[PDB]
Paper text:
In this work, we focus on the hub protein 14-3-3, a highly abundant adaptor and scaffolding protein that binds to hundreds of phosphorylated and mostly intrinsically disordered protein domains. 14-3-3 binds at the extreme C-terminus of ERα via recognition of its penultimate threonine phosphorylation (Thr594), thereby suppressing the transcriptional activity of ERα and concomitant breast cancer cell proliferation.
Excitingly, we noticed an increase in stabilization by increasing the ring size to cyclopentyl groups (117 and 118). Compound 117 (cyclopentyl, ether) showed improved stabilization with both peptides (FA EC50 = 15 ± 2 μM for ERα, 32 ± 8 μM for C-[name]), whereas 118 (cyclopentyl, aniline) showed greater than 30-fold selectivity for ERα (FA EC50 = 5 ± 0.4 μM, EC50 ≥ 150 μM for C-[name]). Crystal structures of these analogues in the presence of the C-[name] peptide showed a similar conformational switch, indeed indicating a steric clash of the aniline conformation (118 EC50 for C-[name] ≥ 150 μM) with C-[name], resulting in a peptide displacement. This explains why the ether analogue 117 was preferred for stabilizing C-[name] (EC50 32 ± 8 μM) because its conformation close to 14-3-3 allowed for the peptide to wrap around the compound. In contrast, for C-[name], this conformation led to steric hindrance, and small groups in position X in combination with ether linkers were preferred to position the compound close to 14-3-3, allowing for C-[name] to wrap around the compound.
Author numbering:
A (entry chain P), D (entry chain P): 255 to 263
B (entry chain A), C (entry chain A): -4 to 231
The structure:
């Protein structure tokens, strides 16, 4: 599993 | 070029329609047109630009990962030769991805960042710059990779310096920037301890400032804080 | 044009990769290239062509419906004037949709249908012809609409005549054709009783032939039969 | 709700 980045506005 | 004849206001209106229709390629083209009118962007407008290009590049990143995995599988001992097609098609998708990243970086350099004086706008754009260098880094190899990684780090770092001076610890742009820079450290820069330390310090400083927030601001901040926590759980 | 330099086998290989990567625009371009090599298509190849264009047009149909709904809302009594942008953008998407439909219809006419002698291939292509005229009908107005509707009906009818003579009632192409022709009757031709009668007769005739099928064939046939049942439930 | 047509292969 890849790390989570900021989601879409 | 192609949007030169359309009103700025019309381009923004159509970007919003394209968002509703999930037509992100159109949305991105409309927002590129809007930026190229030469006026600074409002907060809502910055949001539209970000949403459009994030969706386009997101699709490309997903496709690239699928193809890279197939390619890696084919280059293992005992795998049957199938010719150049997998590499050719992975390269096609890769080139398109790099093109989108270069387009965004071009908009930021001409002239969004230099005209952005307020902390909220400047940090938003420098974070974007870091993100699109990070997406270039995901597909880069060799010495080219080193310079791309350095460019991402430099953009994120300038954004961090401004955000720490000018924004409260719960500000969602500051939180999202720290989240993404932590992802950079873990996934790109081979610095998992830096990633963890950043996520932890960011989380704790935000926690201490939550009492100052209204209900709407509280909801946004805590959402992003939970993402920091999700990563910390993944990483430890 | 652009795929003229690529091997037929390479185009098929890349269509399959594009499917895995959910890159349906690429998949469709690869399959168009394959068709234009001039050789007849295998069953697997026909499937790739169908999957590619169905995904592309499916996206367009969804976007068009979103925009048409916004447009209809704006043209109601008491709604505020917002200028030509909604109509302009709905028209842009519509024109792109029509272009995709015309492309597919072009491939079928040059020269897939005329070279298809076997029932399984000819019915598959005539069903496709009906479907892409049906998608054109969804966005058509006036007298143009009448001729487009007639073209869809004519294609479906020829397919039906062949399938009834040449295929068993459980054949999945025959079942899918009948499903789609029933949808034509209900949604396009203002003939809900014809739609219901077709779905019912198709379902019952398939039911009576299920005993002849192996487990894999049984699973495919019953799935499509359940879709007929779903529509009958919606329509009654 | 729109009627259901044949799904993707
Ligand atoms: C113009 C402006 O202020 N835009 C940023 C604002 C931040 C909060 N928003 C969000 O959608 C969520 O967080 C971020 C944070 C940073 C960035 Cl760059 C994008 C989104 C999404 C997760 C919770 C709030 C709205 C836009
Ligand atoms: C070359 C060939 O025989 N293709 C048709 C075959 C039919 C069954 N398949 C399917 O994916 C399902 O049904 C249809 C039926 C007709 C059409 Cl035109 C497409 C799909 C999908 C629902 C259950 C089986 C595989 C392809
Ligand atoms: Cl290619
Ligand atoms: Cl337009
Ligand atoms: Mg072998
Ligand atoms: Mg390359
Ligand atoms: Mg009013
Ligand atoms: Mg029109």
């Amino acid at each position: 599993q890849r790390s989570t980045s900021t989601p879409n506005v | 070029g192609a949007m030169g004849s359309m009103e700025r206001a019309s381009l923004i209106q159509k970007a919003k329609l394209a968002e509703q229709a999930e037509r992100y390629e159109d949305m991105a083209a409309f927002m590129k047109g809007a930026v190229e009118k030469g006026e600074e962007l409002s907060c809502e407008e910055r949001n539209l630009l970000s949403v459009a290009y994030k969706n386009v590049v997101g699709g490309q990143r997903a496709a690239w990962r699928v193809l890279s995995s197939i390619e890696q599988k084919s280059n293992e001992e005992g795998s049957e030769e199938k010719g150049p097609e997998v590499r050719e098609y992975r390269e096609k998708v890769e080139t398109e991805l790099q093109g989108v990243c270069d387009t965004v970086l071009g908009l930021l350099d001409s002239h969004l960042i230099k005209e952005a004086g307020d902390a909220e706008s400047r940090v938003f754009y420098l974070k974007m710059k870091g993100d699109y260098y990070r997406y270039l880094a995901e597909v880069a190899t060799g010495d080219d990779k080193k310079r791309i990684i350095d460019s991402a780090r430099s953009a994120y770092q300038e954004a961090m310096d401004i955000s720490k001076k000018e924004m409260p610890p719960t500000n969602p742009i500051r939180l999202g920037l720290a989240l993404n820079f932590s992802v950079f450290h873990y996934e790109i820069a081979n610095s998992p301890e830096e990633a963890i330390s950043l996520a932890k310090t960011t989380f704790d400083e935000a926690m201490a400032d939550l009492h100052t927030l209204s209900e709407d601001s509280y909801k946004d901040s805590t959402l992003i804080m939970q993402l920091l926590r999700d990563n910390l759980t993944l990483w430890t």
